């Protein structure tokens, strides 16, 4: 859990001569610093 997620498909490698070029995508790890929650009350009727 140092990173969140990453798509394996994006990992592409180009090799040419003495040079190696790599592309990737990574979703950075994050930490919660806000929680918003909504509550709703409702009536209920029970029978039998």
């Amino acid at each position: 859990n140092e990173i969140q997620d990453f798509p394996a498909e994006d990992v592409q490698v180009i090799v040419e001569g003495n040079e190696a070029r790599i592309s990737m995508t990574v979703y950075p790890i994050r930490s919660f610093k806000k929680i918003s929650v909504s509550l709703v009350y409702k009536q209920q009727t029970l029978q039998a």
Binding site: Q43, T45, L46, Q47, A48
Partner: protein, 117 residues
């Protein structure tokens, strides 16, 4: 109350049974002198709004109705909960005409013609 003819009012038969069942249900148990078991525990059953308290109320009501000797049986019909308000209804089968006739005609041998139940 008065009967309108300057004499004390009187309830007979079904009206009597209504009066006695209402009074028993309304009377808290143990409050009546000389009669610990007469009454009901409904004054303490003002609990939460869940089926459990409904079942407690129903069981207490069935106990209170069964306590009467004349009530051959009682049973739940339907109940519901509307938040604060509870509602329920019961069915009471009093002793049949045949049994009451047999009891009264047997009482002729003694001549009391009165009820000490």
């Amino acid at each position: 109350s008065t009967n309108g003819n300057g004499d004390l009012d009187t309830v007979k038969g079904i009206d009597n049974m209504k009066q006695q069942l209402q009074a028993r249900l309304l009377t808290p148990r143990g409050s009546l002198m000389l009669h610990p078991n007469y009454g009901s525990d409904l004054h303490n059953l003002f609990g939460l709004n869940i089926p459990e308290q409904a079942t407690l109320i129903e069981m207490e009501v069935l106990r209170t109705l069964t306590s009467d000797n004349r009530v051959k049986s009682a049973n739940l019909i339907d109940w519901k909960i509307q938040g604060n308000v509870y509602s329920g209804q019961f069915s009471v089968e009093i002793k049949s005409v045949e049994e009451s006739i047999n009891f009264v005609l047997g009482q002729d041998e003694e001549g009391i013609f009165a009820l000490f139940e």
